[PDB]
Amino acid sequence: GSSGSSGMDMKRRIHLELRNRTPAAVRELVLDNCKSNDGKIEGLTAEFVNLEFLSLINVGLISVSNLPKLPKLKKLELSENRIFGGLDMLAEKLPNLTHLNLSGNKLKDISTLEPLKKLECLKSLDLFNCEVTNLNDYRESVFKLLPQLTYLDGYDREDQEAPDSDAE
């Protein structure tokens, strides 16, 4: 509720929130400081279809198959996760995924963004705290693979940091 409490299964928490109103009537819901089941979302329900803002950090997740079909959700905050690879389910699940943070994940290669080529909407992305960031010309090793990408690590092609307001 008011005082952030840790050590609570996803579903268990999500419930405390729904108490306000249907899970399909919500728009912004931060599911941070929660406990997932062996890295398997056992709460998030497709009902969130409406939801647009989804914050997932320090949740200790490894799988991204459970993720419900969210054709609306455009922003997906993901950090401090154990996502090594297999970012394909996101291409189909979130076909309109524009905002996606991949800083901190267990991505130590470029192939981890192979299935990301399908998504021609990804405007902004972050891959900080990753071995891939070290790879030779990593900045280019990502652009060449993902042409649709406009922003990389905050900065854009012109090497100009992203905006603050009125940002789609």
Coordinates of C-alpha atoms in Angstrom, one line a residue:
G1 CA 0.0 0.0 0.0
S2 CA 1.5 3.2 1.2
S3 CA 4.6 1.7 2.8
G4 CA 6.5 -0.3 0.2
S5 CA 6.5 -3.9 1.4
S6 CA 8.8 -6.6 0.0
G7 CA 8.6 -10.3 0.1
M8 CA 5.1 -10.6 -1.5
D9 CA 4.2 -12.8 -4.4
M10 CA 3.3 -11.0 -7.6
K11 CA -0.4 -12.0 -7.7
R12 CA -0.6 -11.3 -3.9
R13 CA 0.5 -7.8 -4.6
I14 CA -1.4 -7.1 -7.8
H15 CA -4.5 -7.9 -5.8
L16 CA -3.8 -5.1 -3.3
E17 CA -3.8 -2.8 -6.3
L18 CA -6.9 -4.1 -8.0
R19 CA -8.8 -3.5 -4.8
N20 CA -9.1 0.0 -6.3
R21 CA -10.8 -1.0 -9.5
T22 CA -10.9 -3.6 -12.3
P23 CA -7.4 -4.5 -13.6
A24 CA -8.6 -3.5 -17.1
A25 CA -9.5 0.1 -16.0
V26 CA -6.0 0.9 -14.8
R27 CA -3.4 2.8 -16.8
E28 CA -0.3 3.0 -14.6
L29 CA 0.8 0.3 -12.2
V30 CA 4.3 -0.1 -10.9
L31 CA 5.0 -3.8 -9.9
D32 CA 8.4 -3.1 -8.4
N33 CA 9.8 -4.6 -5.2
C34 CA 7.9 -7.8 -5.7
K35 CA 8.6 -11.5 -5.6
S36 CA 8.1 -13.6 -8.8
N37 CA 7.7 -17.4 -8.9
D38 CA 11.0 -18.9 -10.2
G39 CA 11.0 -16.0 -12.7
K40 CA 7.5 -16.8 -13.9
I41 CA 4.9 -14.0 -13.8
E42 CA 2.1 -15.7 -11.7
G43 CA 0.0 -12.6 -11.4
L44 CA -0.1 -10.1 -14.4
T45 CA -3.3 -10.9 -16.2
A46 CA -4.2 -10.1 -19.8
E47 CA -6.9 -7.9 -18.2
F48 CA -4.1 -5.3 -18.0
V49 CA -4.7 -4.9 -21.7
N50 CA -5.6 -1.3 -20.9
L51 CA -2.6 -0.7 -18.8
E52 CA 0.1 1.4 -20.6
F53 CA 2.8 1.8 -17.9
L54 CA 4.5 -1.3 -16.6
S55 CA 7.4 -1.1 -14.2
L56 CA 9.3 -4.4 -13.6
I57 CA 12.6 -4.1 -11.6
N58 CA 14.3 -6.0 -8.9
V59 CA 11.5 -8.6 -9.4
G60 CA 14.1 -11.4 -10.2
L61 CA 12.6 -12.6 -13.5
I62 CA 14.3 -14.9 -16.0
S63 CA 11.4 -15.9 -18.3
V64 CA 9.4 -13.6 -20.5
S65 CA 6.9 -16.1 -21.9
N66 CA 4.2 -15.6 -19.2
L67 CA 4.0 -12.0 -20.1
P68 CA 0.3 -11.4 -21.2
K69 CA -0.6 -10.1 -24.6
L70 CA -0.5 -6.3 -24.2
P71 CA -1.2 -4.7 -27.6
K72 CA -1.5 -1.3 -25.8
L73 CA 1.4 -1.2 -23.3
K74 CA 4.1 0.8 -25.1
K75 CA 6.5 1.4 -22.2
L76 CA 8.2 -1.5 -20.4
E77 CA 10.6 -0.7 -17.6
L78 CA 12.9 -3.7 -17.2
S79 CA 16.1 -3.5 -15.0
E80 CA 18.0 -5.7 -12.6
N81 CA 16.7 -8.8 -14.3
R82 CA 18.3 -12.1 -15.3
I83 CA 17.3 -11.8 -19.0
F84 CA 20.2 -13.5 -20.9
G85 CA 18.4 -13.8 -24.2
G86 CA 15.3 -15.0 -26.0
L87 CA 13.7 -11.6 -26.6
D88 CA 11.3 -12.9 -29.3
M89 CA 8.2 -13.4 -27.2
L90 CA 8.3 -9.6 -26.8
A91 CA 8.3 -9.1 -30.6
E92 CA 4.9 -10.8 -30.9
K93 CA 3.4 -10.1 -27.4
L94 CA 4.2 -6.3 -27.6
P95 CA 4.1 -5.5 -31.4
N96 CA 3.9 -1.8 -30.5
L97 CA 6.7 -1.7 -27.9
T98 CA 8.3 1.7 -28.4
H99 CA 9.9 2.2 -24.9
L100 CA 12.0 -0.6 -23.6
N101 CA 14.8 -0.5 -21.0
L102 CA 17.4 -3.4 -21.2
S103 CA 20.0 -1.9 -18.9
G104 CA 21.4 -4.5 -16.4
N105 CA 20.0 -7.6 -18.1
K106 CA 22.3 -10.6 -18.7
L107 CA 22.8 -9.7 -22.3
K108 CA 26.4 -10.2 -23.3
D109 CA 26.0 -10.3 -27.1
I110 CA 24.3 -8.8 -30.1
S111 CA 22.4 -11.9 -31.1
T112 CA 20.2 -11.1 -28.0
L113 CA 18.7 -8.4 -30.2
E114 CA 18.2 -10.6 -33.3
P115 CA 14.5 -11.1 -32.7
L116 CA 14.2 -7.4 -32.1
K117 CA 14.6 -6.6 -35.8
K118 CA 10.9 -7.6 -36.3
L119 CA 9.8 -4.7 -34.1
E120 CA 9.9 -1.6 -36.3
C121 CA 8.6 0.7 -33.6
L122 CA 11.3 0.6 -31.0
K123 CA 12.3 4.2 -30.9
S124 CA 14.2 4.2 -27.6
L125 CA 16.2 1.5 -25.9
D126 CA 18.8 1.0 -23.1
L127 CA 21.5 -1.7 -22.8
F128 CA 23.7 -0.2 -20.0
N129 CA 25.6 -2.5 -17.7
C130 CA 26.1 -5.2 -20.3
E131 CA 29.1 -6.9 -21.9
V132 CA 27.5 -6.2 -25.3
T133 CA 28.1 -2.5 -24.6
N134 CA 31.9 -3.3 -24.6
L135 CA 31.8 -5.2 -27.9
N136 CA 33.7 -3.4 -30.7
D137 CA 31.6 -0.5 -32.0
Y138 CA 28.7 -1.9 -29.9
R139 CA 26.9 1.3 -30.7
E140 CA 27.0 0.3 -34.4
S141 CA 26.7 -3.4 -33.8
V142 CA 23.2 -2.7 -32.6
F143 CA 22.1 0.0 -35.1
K144 CA 23.1 -2.2 -38.1
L145 CA 20.9 -5.0 -36.6
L146 CA 18.0 -2.7 -35.5
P147 CA 17.6 0.0 -38.2
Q148 CA 14.2 1.0 -36.9
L149 CA 15.9 2.0 -33.6
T150 CA 16.2 5.8 -33.3
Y151 CA 17.6 6.2 -29.8
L152 CA 20.5 4.2 -28.3
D153 CA 21.6 4.5 -24.7
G154 CA 19.7 7.8 -24.2
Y155 CA 21.6 9.5 -27.1
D156 CA 20.2 9.4 -30.7
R157 CA 22.0 8.8 -34.0
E158 CA 23.1 12.5 -34.0
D159 CA 24.6 11.7 -30.6
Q160 CA 22.0 14.0 -28.9
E161 CA 20.5 13.0 -25.5
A162 CA 16.8 12.3 -25.5
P163 CA 14.2 14.9 -24.6
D164 CA 12.5 15.4 -21.3
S165 CA 8.9 16.4 -22.0
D166 CA 6.5 16.1 -24.9
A167 CA 8.2 12.8 -25.7
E168 CA 5.4 10.8 -27.4

